[PDB]
Design a binder for this molecule. Structure first.
Ligand SMILES: C[S@@+](CC[C@H](N)C(=O)[O-])C[C@H]1O[C@@H](n2cnc3c(N)ncnc32)[C@H](O)[C@@H]1O
Ligand SMILES: [Zn+2]
Ligand SMILES: [Zn+2]
Ligand SMILES: [Zn+2]
Length: 232
């Protein structure tokens, strides 16, 4: 391939990735609503303050089991609650690096335990009409990098213009992280969680599950033995 010879030159030249606005929390756009519930619609888990790790990765916690974050004024474990990861934004340390075939990627600077919260997939929250427009734009300009992930009907996260490090995590068919929809303070959020123990220096990947909007035709370069050929 003469395509490859090109990408070898490229990997040496581009020193920084294209710029984006680094945000902490989803930012709705146009008509897009964000929902809330009364505290009464937030479940109280089975954990106790006296437990060893109340609401932790390895506890019996029904909230964590059913992908509900605890509310700190509702959880019986109180401030000892280890199930407030989205709200608190404590992420493992990570850094951007340049791959050969998959643009910029993300690698951890620390060890990560199986089940650990790694990041939230954060961006602009846009509708289908704004999503179609941005994908049309990118097609007309030979752009193949998409950052769009559906939260629910007519609410799409675009980590492209605005987002956090999660936007640099490539698809793999043999991934070490997984995307999950959690209920947080009465609305949905997308979290990334380690499938296994990950060593410092390793790239962080997830199965896009064909949810990366615009990548429907894209050939997978993950290089795994069981590669599907596609971003799913
Ligand atoms: C959320 S971005 C990930 C970061 C991106 N690599 C960058 O340089 O900003 C997703 C895009 O990365 C590329 N990509 C990610 N995983 C890939 C894979 N396994 N094979 C091919 N391209 C991939 C595609 O262009 C896709 O639209
Ligand atoms: Zn609990
Ligand atoms: Zn709790
Ligand atoms: Zn693959």
């Amino acid at each position: 391939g003469k395509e490859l010879r090109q990408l070898q030159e490229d990997r040496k030249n581009d020193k920084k990735p294209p710029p984006y606005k680094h945000i902490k929390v989803n930012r709705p756009i146009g008509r897009v609503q964000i929902f809330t519930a009364d505290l009464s619609e937030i479940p109280r888990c089975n954990c106790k303050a006296t437990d060893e790790n109340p609401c932790g990765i390895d506890s019996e916690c029904i909230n964590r089991m059913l992908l509900y974050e605890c509310h700190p004024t509702v959880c019986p474990a109180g401030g000892r609650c280890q199930n407030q990861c989205f709200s608190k934004r404590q992420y493992p340390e990570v850094e951007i690096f340049r791959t050969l075939q998959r643009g910029w990627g993300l690698r951890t600077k620390t060890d990560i335990k199986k089940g650990e919260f790694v990041n939230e997939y954060v961006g602009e929250l846009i509708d289908e009409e704004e999503c179609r427009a941005r994908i049309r734009y990118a097609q007309e300009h030979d752009i193949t990098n998409f950052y769009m992930l559906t939260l629910d009907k007519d609410r799409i996260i675009d980590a492209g213009p605005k987002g956090n490090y999660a936007r640099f995590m490539n698809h793999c068919c043999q991934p070490n992280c997984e995307a999950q929809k959690w209920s947080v303070n009465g609305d949905t959020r997308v979290g990334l969680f380690a499938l296994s123990d990950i060593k410092a220096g390793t790239e962080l990947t997830f199965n896009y599950n064909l949810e990366c909007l615009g990548n429907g035709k894209t050939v997978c370069k993950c290089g795994a033995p069981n590669c599907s050929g596609f971003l799913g």
